[PDB]
Amino acid sequence: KNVVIYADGVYDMLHLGHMKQLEQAKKLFENTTLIVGVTSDNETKLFKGQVVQTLEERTETLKHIRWVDEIISPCPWVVTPEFLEKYKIDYVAHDDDIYAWLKRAGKFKATQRTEGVSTTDLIVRILKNY
Amino acid sequence: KNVVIYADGVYDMLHLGHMKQLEQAKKLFENTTLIVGVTSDNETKLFKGQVVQTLEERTETLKHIRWVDEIISPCPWVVTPEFLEKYKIDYVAHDDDIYAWLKRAGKFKATQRTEGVSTTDLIVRILKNY
């Protein structure tokens, strides 16, 4: 009855958006284990772009988040069928094609986002006072 | 065996510091319920100073924090003996005198802090790139 869900991401400067996403992953089914993978510095920097917090900083914040059951840190950049077996993962949870093969296999669970929540946004608000 | 702990604060722009503090509160004893009180906008603005996030924003972030069991939002600015009875609170957890009367009653549990963790600090780091 327990369903293993994997959600990877950068999780740089974690905010309310990441949390709502993670809550969604956690509640995809009645009994889940939410595994969260945190991408390495080198690989992030080389694909997405600069990253603000180091791996250790981004991993530690996730330790206080109610929905996170287990953490793989650092996680591989690209999910592979072998990875899924090795960790007994039943579904991958990401927003919405690199994940076509997951949908074809029935193992793709979509999760939505929430805007206006970024750290950056709040600084924007705080300067408006001047 | 279950010990009720109350930790109030502003919790503006919650960061790793608040989380470590809250974890400490939660683990003061083996079986706790951590009640977290979140101060109102009007009262915060009038004592501490300007506040960046509204009550609703500050309360919602706390909903994703592993250590928070219950939330009083908004909470009174000053803890009173009557408050302690009304919510069956066994200890109050705050950093370190308004709390002398709590220490005299045996109901004061100290919790420490961690520096270099503020939202503000990370923006400081991010601008250094220019």
**CA atoms A115, A118, A124, A127: torsion sign:** positive
Pairwise CB contact (< 8 Å): A23 & B125: no
Smallest Cβ–Cβ distance between A65 and the set B52, B66, B122 belongs to B66
From chain A, the residues in CB contact with B60 under 8 A are 16
Neighbours of A40 (CB within 10 A): 17
In chain B, which residues have their Cβ closer than 8 Å to the Cβ of A129? 50
Euclidean distance between CA atoms B122 and A13, whole angstroms:
9
How determined?
Answer: X-ray
Q: Using H for helix, E for strand and C for coil, what is the string for chain A?
A: CCEEEEEEECCCCCCHHHHHHHHHHHCCCCCEEEEEEEECHHHHHHHCCCCCCCHHHHHHHHCCECCCCEEEEEECCCCCHHHHHHCCCCEEEECCCCCHHHHHHCCEEECCCCCCCCHHHHHHHHHCCC
Q: Could you tell me the resolution of this structure in angstroms?
A: 2.2
Q: Nearest CA to CA, how far is B12 from chain A (Å)?
A: 11
Is the domain covering B3-127 a CATH 3.90.1300.10 domain? no
Joined together, the tokens standing for residue A81 give: 């069928």
Q: Which residues of A touch B66 (CB under 8 A)?
A: 63-66, 68
CA–CA distances in Å: residue B107 to residues A19, A46, B29, B68, B89? 33, 52, 13, 20, 9
Residue B15: which of A22, A36, A60, A24 has the closest Cα?
Answer: A60
Give yes or no for a contact between A14 and A102, defined as CB atoms under 8 angstroms apart.
no
Most B CBs within 10 A among A14, A64, A68, hence the mutation to make, goes to A64
Q: CA torsion B47→B48→B50→B53, rounded to 10°? A: -110
Measure the CA–CA gap between A29 and A37, rounded to whole angstroms: 19
Whose tokens are 């608000």? That residue is A125
A64–B13 CB contact, under 8 Å: no
Question: In this complex, is the C-beta atom of A59 within 8 Å of any C-beta atom belonging to chain B?
Answer: no
Under DSSP, the state recorded for B65 is B
